[PDB]
Symmetry: D2
Subunit: 337 residues, 4 copies
């Protein structure tokens, strides 16, 4: 029968997930919601015609014996608390980024999870479920190119609003590269360095954009990540892995080609939300399927959330200092292997 899901936080992202589970995916139902604004949570229940109980807070929601699993989609700084509560209630949890606002916060979650003795926590890094990244991973695991030596990647966005700050380039943007790369090559980060090219005319005065982030893994892989969030031409994710004997590269999103007015061309997406639409569906379906069939979650773990937190911290530190900063990671427990 259905995985009974409770949703913590019914803003934009919560609603997207509620719609996804209710109208797109298989094997789950939203049976409980809670939001800080009780009125909005009730509106979401009518909007999506749910047979769902509205709770005033996450504690009461998690005490519902008929809730099997929860989605944490609230205000970012509020995530860690709900994730901890869900773990103590021994219920599966899918948490949108971030897992916690600090490495210490991530560690707290890690510790409680290791206690429980099974995987409850899945973090919403959806790139691992994208078909392009799955293909790169399969090629690497089959040794198509030999040992990875270097990674060249770019995260580009047409324009950002006035609220977007320099730190957000790593904390909100490069965080996705940070999660997916160590997964692809199975190696931990060791150091980071940030280099600023001349500033783009497309960037607001307070914002350092573009940026280059150079990351070295413990095994000696060197990653050059370009971040340019005011590139104007489109939203563009590029990733090239250079191995000893060959090179693999992420594909462009599928597009018909056009020959017109002296150009041969394909489309470039303009909206970041459209780049990984398929991956959001697959990641939640995997959450549901893995729980139903295996009794624990797969996909990005609480430890992956910890790695992201420590690495983003080091990047923001390197943004400020201009020197090479250490990424200091605890040893990966056997629990997460």
């Amino acid at each position: 029968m259905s995985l009974r899901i409770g949703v913590i936080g019914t803003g934009k992202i919560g609603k997207e997930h509620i719609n996804r589970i209710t109208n797109k995916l298989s094997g789950a139902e939203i049976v409980a919601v809670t939001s800080v604004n009780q009125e909005a949570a009730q509106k979401v229940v009518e909007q999506y015609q749910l047979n769902a109980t509205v709770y005033p807070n996450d504690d009461s929601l998690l005490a519902d014996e008929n809730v099997d699993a929860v989605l944490v989609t609230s205000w970012g700084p509020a995530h860690e608390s709900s994730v901890l509560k869900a773990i103590k209630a021994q219920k599966y949890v899918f948490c949108e980024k971030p897992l916690a606002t600090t490495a210490e916060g991530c560690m707290r979650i890690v510790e409680e999870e290791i206690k429980v003795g099974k995987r409850l926590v899945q973090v919403g890094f959806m790139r691992r479920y994208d078909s392009g990244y799955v293909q790169l991973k399969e090629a690497l695991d089959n040794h198509v190119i030999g040992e990875p030596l270097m990674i060249h990647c770019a995260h580009r966005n047409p324009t950002v609003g006035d609220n977007y700050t320099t730190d957000m380039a790593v904390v909100d943007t490069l965080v996705h590269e940070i999660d997916v790369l160590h997964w692809l090559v199975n190696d931990d980060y060791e150091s980071v360095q940030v280099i600023y090219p001349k500033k783009s005319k497309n960037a607001l005065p307070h914002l350092k954009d573009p940026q280059i982030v150079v990351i070295e893994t413990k095994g000696g892989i060197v990653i050059n990540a370009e971040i340019y969030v005011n590139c104007k031409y489109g939203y563009d994710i590029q990733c090239e892995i250079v191995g000893e004997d060959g090179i693999i590269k992420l594909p462009e999103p599928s597009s018909i080609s056009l020959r017109k007015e002296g150009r041969f061309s394909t489309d470039i997406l303009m909206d970041w939300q459209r780049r990984f639409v398929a991956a959001y569906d697959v990641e939640i379906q995997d959450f549901i399927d893995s729980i139903q069939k295996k009794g624990e979650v797969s996909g990005p773990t609480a430890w992956d959330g910890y790695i992201a937190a420590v690495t983003t911290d080091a990047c923001v530190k390197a943004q400020e200092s201009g020197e090479k900063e250490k990424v200091e990671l605890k040893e990966k427990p056997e629990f997460y292997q």
Copy 2:
């Protein structure tokens, strides 16, 4: 609540659909099955853990007041009969190719449907739901290239078994091109001609392969379709539309690129079943969603099935005669516009 679906025919294709609806898609449930082999239908119910009643035939299944819609996935020549029965029972029907074995059979269905006064019948031509074809259609509807003048397409397959005959190149293979093209350019076929290049070493002696089929629409669009089912290199669908002012082309299925041993390359699929995996999901979801929200089906119609039957007939006739054969189509009723 759920669209309650009955499945007529529980062979490979039926089971794929039962799995799709039960484990992948949203808003429907299999509540009834029937197969010629009663024992196999019961096995399918256990296999997929369905809360479903097993019926000895389609009449009794269609008389189940709690069946809202049916899938017809039985032996091809058996389709027409079930489709007719479902229409008379005023229940929605998704029918796998073919709709009927003859144009006359398709017309019978058309006539009964026009009576009912609403769209009950959806035919399983899944290409219309493929994202590449959706993009081509959107470009055409927005007049990106002006009037379509010519279409160059290819349907290639690595190898076929000894059962595959010359007629099957049009009846089983080109039928997909036949459905999607008139849809893309909104024009009816008028004539066809078949040309045989020298025979491939990869083809069995009884089989004429490759083949070229030249189709002219009533508006004067000329289509050159290459069929080569023993091409050895892969399964490959290519489609290029040449308009007055530009040219649009279907993309390759997404693949990472590789630089290795003196070649820069991407993958070509080997299995025809994998080419349109996404489209099968989307087509059935559309069947469900369109019924639930609109009270009738969208997607390929009984008339589209009729167009396919008449056109394939003319192609097989041209295969035999070697001359240009007329495609004689009745006028498209307002019902299907």
Copy 3:
């Protein structure tokens, strides 16, 4: 020492060749010119600072003991006469298209050449010297794709002037495809059929454009050639050869790529003169080098000119008749093998 070259016809094409030999290529010098307009020939001698004698006609030029070889670049219908005279004077001749205005004219030249006992005549079909076509030829000769079965090609041009007529699509345009294809696959044409799609808005009322020409070779290769001289988007040569075990395709002319304003694109040439600029240089250098080192010419022969004349004739006949027309070719002499 230098190949001493005389030029017959000092219009645009002659001047291009005179410049090429004088200022670009190695091992030849223009030592004689003749034109119908004596005044223009003298102007060309000053313009290019030649140490060259001006003759009133081709007879006197060919009687110059210090002329080793000639270029025939006069008015098309005037070519055959000069080519014949040069052969009788046993001097090497490079002839711009056409070799003669009729198949009979080509045969006259063929007969006289076979007498001489060595290759004097090279015809200006420059595609054979284009690096893309050289690569296709090398792949075929090395059996990369097995037996050629089908060829899909296109010859597209942005727009043509009011003087361009329906026959010119084959006589002036497809003539290049006609020469290069039988060379690539080493097979003779057997029949042709012309099909007219709906007429482009970009074409003048007197002109049938676009056109499709279907050609079958004696070995059973089927060629679908699209001609569209008012395609507006660019000048575009496309050629795809489908073999038993694989497919090879001519590359796009080299262009940097651009990501800008939501498109990823490369350039398409607009001018037909630029498509094969390199090939003109290579073809004349080969004329010079082959003579100097081998004492006879290589490259397209008088027989290749004959094949073109017979085939273009059959195409124009098929343009008019609408039926499949025979290409009736004499047996290729051992001389041209």
Copy 4:
């Protein structure tokens, strides 16, 4: 009449140039040669059938009143001396890399040239004449992408012999990137940093390979250059320039495409000598044409040679130190603007 050329150094590179001028290009003749091995110089004169005087040294060659210009193609450390002598003899000089073994050596040449008051010296950096780089330059000059902010490039080679050392990655290899990039974006280098990924299994123990070189220009452009001379898959030059509003990228060398055995592919060159074959021809023709028409040389200057020497020095220093090193360049004289 012909540019009369003397060649200093008749080894492999000299002979290639002698062949090029004698048998490929227009408007020049080799009229003098000198080599350390007098016997080999005489052999080269017979080999290429030159009407050329053999001199025992460069002084006597440069004193030949009938030598207009010289090629310096001797042992690298011997270049500077001949270049200086040629300048004092006020004769045009094409010098193969390097112009001199030190920045000081380059400056000596610069000083003497500024005296003469006109451009005599052209340095053999052939990339500037490659059609791909010409296109990138044209796009930049026309502001297609706005201000350049970042450059991502790679110089890859299949394998190197045991003589190839770590310093040679910058001195023999990246020197080409070093010359072409400041030319493309019209900005001077300011600092460099070298980063070593884990060592490739394909590299000999004494060799650090691959390498990443990060270069910042004075205007704030950041260049990430990957050097990998044991990449095994091919010889590969990649160059992507990221501007404020768009991105331009160097094309792949032209290749037919192949669909075969489940892959769609194009060729990658294996030999570094073939990558820029066209550019060598064009660069020498430009040397000849520019002298004949303009009375001075164009193309890469003695100052460009100086920039290369200073930058390569800083790179080798950064290879050793592991820190960011300053590129200290004198002010570009008006003479070279």
